[PDB]
Amino acid sequence: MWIGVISLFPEMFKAITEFGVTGRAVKHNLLKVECWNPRDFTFDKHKTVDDRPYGGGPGMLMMVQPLRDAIHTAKAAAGEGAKVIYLSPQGRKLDQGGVTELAQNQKLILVCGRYEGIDERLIQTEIDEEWSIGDYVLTGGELPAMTLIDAVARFIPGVLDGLLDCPHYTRPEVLEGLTVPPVLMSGHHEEIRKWRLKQSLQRTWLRRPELLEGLALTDEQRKLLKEAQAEHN
Amino acid sequence: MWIGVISLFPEMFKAITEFGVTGRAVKHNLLKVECWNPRDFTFDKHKTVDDRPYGGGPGMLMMVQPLRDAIHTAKAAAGEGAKVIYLSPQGRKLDQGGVTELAQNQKLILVCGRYEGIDERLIQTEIDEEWSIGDYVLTGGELPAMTLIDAVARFIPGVLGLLDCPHYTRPEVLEGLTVPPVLMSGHHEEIRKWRLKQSLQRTWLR
Ligand SMILES: NCc1ccc(CNC(=O)c2csc3nc[nH]c(=O)c23)cc1
Numbered sequence: 257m258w259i260g261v262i263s264l265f266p267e268m269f270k271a272i273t274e275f276g277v278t279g280r281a282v283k284h285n286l287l288k289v290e291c292w293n294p295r296d297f298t299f300d301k302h303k304t305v306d307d308r309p310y311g312g313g314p315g316m317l318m319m320v321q322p323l324r325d326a327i328h329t330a331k332a333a334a335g336e337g338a339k340v341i342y343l344s345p346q347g348r349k350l351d352q353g354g355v356t357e358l359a360q361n362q363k364l365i366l367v368c369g370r371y372e373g374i375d376e377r378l379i380q381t382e383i384d385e386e387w388s389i390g391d392y393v394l395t396g397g398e399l400p401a402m403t404l405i406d407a408v409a410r411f412i413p414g415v416l417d418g419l420l421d422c423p424h425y426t427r428p429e430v431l432e433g434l435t436v437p438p439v440l441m442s443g444h445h446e447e448i449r450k451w452r453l454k455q456s457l458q459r460t461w462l463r464r465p466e467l468l469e470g471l472a473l474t475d476e477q478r479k480l481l482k483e484a485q486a487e488h489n
Numbered sequence: 490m491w492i493g494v495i496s497l498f499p500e501m502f503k504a505i506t507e508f509g510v511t512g513r514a515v516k517h518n519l520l521k522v523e524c525w526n527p528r529d530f531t532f533d534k535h536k537t538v539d540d541r542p543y544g545g546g547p548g549m550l551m552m553v554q555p556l557r558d559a560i561h562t563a564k565a566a567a568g569e570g571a572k573v574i575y576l577s578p579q580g581r582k583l584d585q586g587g588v589t590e591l592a593q594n595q596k597l598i599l600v601c602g603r604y605e606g607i608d609e610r611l612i613q614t615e616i617d618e619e620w621s622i623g624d625y626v627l628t629g630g631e632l633p634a635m636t637l638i639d640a641v642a643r644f645i646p647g648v649l650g651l652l653d654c655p656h657y658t659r660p661e662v663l664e665g666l667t668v669p670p671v672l673m674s675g676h677h678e679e680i681r682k683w684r685l686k687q688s689l690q691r692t693w694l695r
């Protein structure tokens with residue numbers, strides 16, 4: 257997979273390319289991430305990357321020429337078929353279904369914005385889609401772009417339902433006097449699977465009940481969920 | 490604000506400490522971020538940071554001893570009143586109300602998990618709260634921790650309900666597309682912004 261990035265802080269992307277799972281994907285030529293900075297496309301001594309809005313009022317926008325030229329250089333490096341994504345606080349909110357869709361692309365271009373955003377005409381002429389990583393305010397699109405890279409990289413071959421995970425335990429047998437649930441030491445696989453499934457259903461119900469609303473459950477899951485609910489009283 | 494971080498990849502945090510608004514906050518002593526790596530708390534030649542789950546199944550967990558010792562060193566650096574946060578897919582899903590609450594803390598300790606996560610008993614013995622950044626799967630807690638730092642840093646003094654109306658800057662004509670004529674005249678007449686914000690919202694989402 258090839259990923260082009262437009263950012264005023266391209267060195268932030270070393271957090272992705274030099275470390276962990278994405279870092280090993282880069283070293284093994286399974287993932288390639290290339291960055292271009294609009295500041296490097298400026299013509300003036302002050303390397304001006306912002307510009308005033310026609311409307312008026314407060315806030316600046318990214319200057320069109322340096323940003324458009326950087327996007328064009330990423331498009332020329334990408335070649336045919338790259339999808340251009342603008343990371344925006346008001347774009348489509350990312351979820352696992354969204355990640356799965358984005359991961360079908362062999363080539364992506366991720367545009368990070370700063371200030372109040374980008375000119376509407378650049379969205380119409382250079383952007384394919386707009387995406388957000390959640391309903392919270394950040395200083396820019398760099399952390400969202402890196403989050404998107406990490407999520408999609410998991411889908412690349414060679415790099416590596418709907419319920420929260422069950423509790424997990426490892427050594428020691430006694431941690432600050434607290435013991436591991438005996439079923440996990442029993443060697444009874446079906447009892448362990450049913451205990452973990454019941455815990456997963458209970459944790460989903462107590463912490464994130466909305467996740468159960470749009471979820472078809474098996475007879476076993478329905479039976480185990482009712483059991484945990486009854487024991488909760 | 491002081492933030493302690495537990496991570497197997499502490500160098501990832503330079504993306505926060507060396508650049509942009511958080512980088513500026515660090516340079517002006519408004520924000521301090523200190524990192525400890527569980528690998529530095531290992532006793533064996535192979536610096537083993539993972540361990541096998543009881544009950545089997547695929548996946549490994551973070552080894553308890555190196556992780557617990559690293560958390561303890563961050564707690565000793567923090568002193569009284571630090572809130573310990575585990576970045577977890579099973580945690581409270583972050584939103585702006587959540588950021589506002591987290592931002593009231595002068596001291597945080599952010600614990601980043603790798604592999605399938607951490608021992609449930611470490612959550613009871615060490616963790617104050619669990620937080621997620623969204624309903625998507627990542628390779629670790631580091632990008633969520635950095636996202637949390639950036640969001641809360643906006644609340645530090647000295648650092649800084651509708652869909653937006655479209656905005657325009659130079660040039661007047663871009664790829665044959667002109668700026669709406671309204672945007673070059675009357676201040677009150679520009680109430681076309683308020684209408685476009687409503688018109689965009691009605692057409693996009695509710
Ligand atoms: N005044 C409106 C305004 C404008 C820009 C910004 C800067 N933020 C981003 O560029 C951003 C990109 S994707 C994303 N996903 C979640 N949260 C975010 O903030 C983001 C914040 C708020």
Ligand SMILES: NCc1ccc(CNC(=O)c2csc3nc[nH]c(=O)c23)cc1
Nearest residue numbers: 576577605621622625626627629630633
């Ligand atoms: N199979 C269980 C499992 C365990 C760990 C991980 C690694 N992920 C995290 O540690 C994480 C922390 S906060 C967050 N917020 C959104 N998404 C995330 O993945 C995260 C993924 C899946």
